[PDB]
Structure formats: structure tokens, C-alpha cells
Amino acid sequence: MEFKDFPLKPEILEALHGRGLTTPTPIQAAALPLALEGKDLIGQARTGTGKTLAFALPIAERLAPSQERGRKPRALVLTPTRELALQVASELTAVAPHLKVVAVYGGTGYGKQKEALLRGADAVVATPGRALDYLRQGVLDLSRVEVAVLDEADEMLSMGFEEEVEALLSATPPSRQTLLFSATLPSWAKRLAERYMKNPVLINVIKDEPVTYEEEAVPAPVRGRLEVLSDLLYVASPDRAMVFTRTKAETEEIAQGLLRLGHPAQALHGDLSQGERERVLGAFRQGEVRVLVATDVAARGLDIPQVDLVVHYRLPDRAEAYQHRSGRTGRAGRGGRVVLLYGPRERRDVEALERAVGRRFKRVN
């Protein structure tokens, strides 16, 4: 079905078509029928899936225009970062020209956002900390919210916003539509689905997502590869990074090496107990650990957070392994980056990978 085939108001369709948007992405095609009818859903998606429009369109269609001075918002979208709040606010503004969208975030003054809220708003796109400040001030009123969106729930959890998110949702009416989007579903997300949502349908598009990350094949010697990795990590300065290697022993050697060189790194391998694995992934999610060095076996699962950089320390054996590793990159609206380290010997190994993947990697020449 094209967008014109969905039940959308004439102005909304015209806005889509003006931007050359005609055909829903998979998450949009699956979510729209439920979302347009005000039902709750969990959208398990990563990068470049079009999840923003999957909630912006229902907000646009469900909310009628209002010119009431000082009006309270009827939609709340919560995002983990200022960067994402700005991108989402921008998209919602273009999808719904009839709604006043207000972006709310910290790092700046309180004055301009306060004035905008007081003037009247239809939708608020906010980081949870600043939204909560305005709520307690009495500036942001959420009693008329009809749609609440949690965009990247697992990352809000990682930024320490869990209690803020729950407070904000509790300030909205219980008849609200709730839409939750997240790459992973940790315990806190499942608690939300249970206590803050109404039997949401889960739609998981992980297996049908476009490649959004930058890929670079980097020639690197076997000897002293650790220093090469460490310098790359300092230069790139990712908030979270995952480094893949072949064996358990390697994950230990590398994690310990990176720790010695100043990186908060930990090994993730198959011989850890569930306690050990839970603590590692928990520390990773929380930011206490920022580099995870893992084997392919240990990284299988839904409990692994998205990262900003994936490094292939050894080459993957197969295209399947390459994609499983590399798909972990990209969070918070950013496409992320993948680096394949390869030695003097492995040129054809890389070419075979490219052939199998059906995609050429950028050569650092």
C-alpha cells in the first residue's frame, strides 16, 4: 500500500508527497494500521527504518488543529538526547503542518522553551530531565496528552532517565495511546509494556532494515594490532563500542590490553555465568563499561545494546557473521560506523566478504 492508500487527511498526504514520500517502510506498513486506530505497540527497530514517521503520522492524523491560546499539548514524545529531540521535532513539524511542535531539552536556558510552552503547544518533543523540570514547575501540563511516544527506550534507560520517564507517563491520562520504540527490550522496557501500556503488539523489523552505517576496511598489521585498535578508539571517541574477535582467550587479552591503555573495556564470552554476563551488559548499558570485546557466540541474543562503533578485530568467517556483528552499530538517530581491520594477507578474504555481503567496503588507501 502507498501512503495515499492509508486513511490520511488531505494536507498530510500532500505534505508527504511534496517531500517525495510515497511508500511506507516495513515498520511504517506494519505499524500504521494499529497506530492510526490509537492502539499501543512496541516497535523493535534500529537505524534507518523510518520509525520517526511511524509515530509522527499517527500523531498528525489523530490530532485536530487548535488555535487556542495557552493550550496544553496532546502529544508527548520522549527522546534520550537533545540531538534526537531536534530531529524528531523537525520531522513532526513537516508531517503535521497543522500542529505547533515544541522541542524541549537542556544544555541551554529555560527561558525560550518556557515561553513557547506557555504560548500554547500541540506536541512536545523532549528529553525527560528537562520535561520533568517544566512539569514540576507547572509550565508543562500533560493532563491532555492523547499520544505518548518513547523513542529509543533502551537508551533513555542508559542515560539514567528511567524514573523521569515513569513520572512523565504517570502525569498523562491512562487512556493515552503509548508507542514504544527500542532496539532491545531490557527488563525496564518489559515493565513499561506491562504497567504503562495496554497489551501492546510487538513489531520487530530487525531482519528487514537498510544498512545505515559507514563501513571502512582498514589495513592493519597483526603485530601491534592492539595499539592500532586503541588509537582508533581514542580518535573516534565512541560513547559505546563493540570489538569482535574469534576466541574467548582473545576477548580477555584484548579487553585487558585496552584497559591497560585507558579504556573501560570488558570481555564478553560464552564461559561467563548469567550473573557475570548480566553484570557486564548492565555495566555496558549504564556506561561504566564503554568497550565490549566479544565473540560471535556470546553476542548472539537480544540483550546486547546498540553501539556507535563496531570493530572487527578478526575478520568474520561468513557474511551472516559480518551482518550480525555490524548490525549492532547505530543508536540515537546516528547511523554509526563499522571498521574491519585486516592484515597484509587477507585481501581476498575481504573481497570474498564483500562478494558474500554484496557490498563494497570503503578502503582506507
Which of Na ion, ligand AMP, none is residue 53 near (CB under 5 to 8 Å by kind)?
ligand AMP
- Let me know: does 232 contact 311? Beta carbons within 8 Å: yes
Binding to ligand AMP (CB under 6 A) within 3-22 occurs at: 21
Instruction: Tell me if 44 contacts ligand AMP by CB under 6 A.
Output: no
Instruction: Compute how many residues bind ligand AMP; rule: CB under 6 A.
Output: 12
Report, in Å, the least distance between residue 333 CB and ligand AMP: 6
Residue 109 class from Cβ within 10 Å (0-12 exposed, 13-18 middle, 19+ buried)?
exposed
Of 197 and 203, the one with the shorter C-beta distance to Na ion is: 203
**Strand ranges inside the chain, DSSP E:** 41-44, 75-78, 101-104, 123-126, 147-151, 177-181, 201-204, 214-219, 241-244, 265-268, 291-294, 309-312, 337-342, 362-363
Q: What is the phi/psi pair of residue 297, to 5°?
A: -60, -45
Q: What is the DSSP string of 106-151?
A: SSS-SHHHHHHHHH--SEEEE-HHHHHHHHHHTSS--TT--EEEEE
Tell me the closest approach of the beta carbon of residue 339 to Na ion, in angstroms. 17
Check residue 48 for interaction with ligand AMP (CB under 6 A).
yes
The per-residue b/e assignment along 223-244, b for 16 or more CB within 10 angstroms, e otherwise, is: eebbebbbebbeeeebebbbbb
In whole angstroms, how close is the CB of 16 to Na ion at the nearest point?
Answer: 11
Inter-residue contact 171 to 72 (CB < 8 Å):
no
Binding-site member from 6, 12, 15, 25 for ligand AMP (CB under 6 A): 25
Which residue lies nearer to ligand AMP by CB, 27 or 341?
27
Report the C-alpha gap between 346 and 240 in whole angstroms.
27
Residue 52 marked as a ligand binder: yes
From the DSSP assignment, how many helices (H) and strands (E) are in the chain?
A: 14, 14
Q: For CA atoms 336, 251, 295, 302, give the dihedral sign.
A: negative
- Name the residue nearer to Na ion (CB basis): 47 or 178: 47
Size of the site for Na ion (CB under 5 A): 4
Between 48 and 343, name the residue whose CB sits nearer to ligand AMP. 48
Pick 83 or 303: Cβ nearer ligand AMP:
83
Binding flag, residue 323, Na ion (CB under 5 A)? no
**Is there binding between residue 93 and Na ion (CB under 5 A)?**
no
Alpha helices in 63-121 (DSSP H): 82-95, 111-119
Distance CA 93, CA 99 (A): 7
**Residue 33 to residues 76, 98, 177, Cα–Cα distance (Å):** 20, 22, 14
- Asked whether position 209 contacts Na ion by CB under 5 A, the answer is yes
Give the dihedral sign, CA 219/220/226/231. Answer: negative
Q: How far apart are CA 50 and CA 358, in angstroms?
A: 23
Binding mask 29-58 for Na ion (x = CB under 5 A): ------------------xx----------
Q: Considering the rule CB under 5 A, would residue 212 count as an interface residue with Na ion?
A: yes
Q: If contact means CB under 5 to 8 A according to the sort of partner, which of Na ion, ligand AMP, none does residue 28 touch?
A: ligand AMP
Instruction: Report the residue number, 102 or 332, with the smaller CB distance to Na ion.
Output: 332
Q: Does 50 bind ligand AMP (CB under 6 A)?
A: yes
Residue 23 marked ligand-binding: yes
Q: Choosing among Na ion, ligand AMP, none, which partner's interface includes residue 209 (Cβ < 5 to 8 Å by kind)?
A: Na ion
Does residue 274 have a known ligand-binding role? no
Contact between 48 and 72 under an 8 Å Cβ cutoff? The reply is no
The residues in 308-347 that bind ligand AMP, with binding defined as CB under 6 A, are 333
Among 6, 15, 44, 49, binds ligand AMP (CB under 6 A): 49
- What does the per-residue mask of binding to Na ion show for 265-284, with x meaning CB under 5 A? --------------------
Binding residues for AMP: 23, 28, 49-52
Site residues for Na ion per CB under 5 A: 47-48, 209, 212
Which residue ranges are tagged as binding site?
23, 28, 49-52
| Residues in touch with ligand AMP (CB under 6 A) | 21, 23-25, 28, 48-53, 333
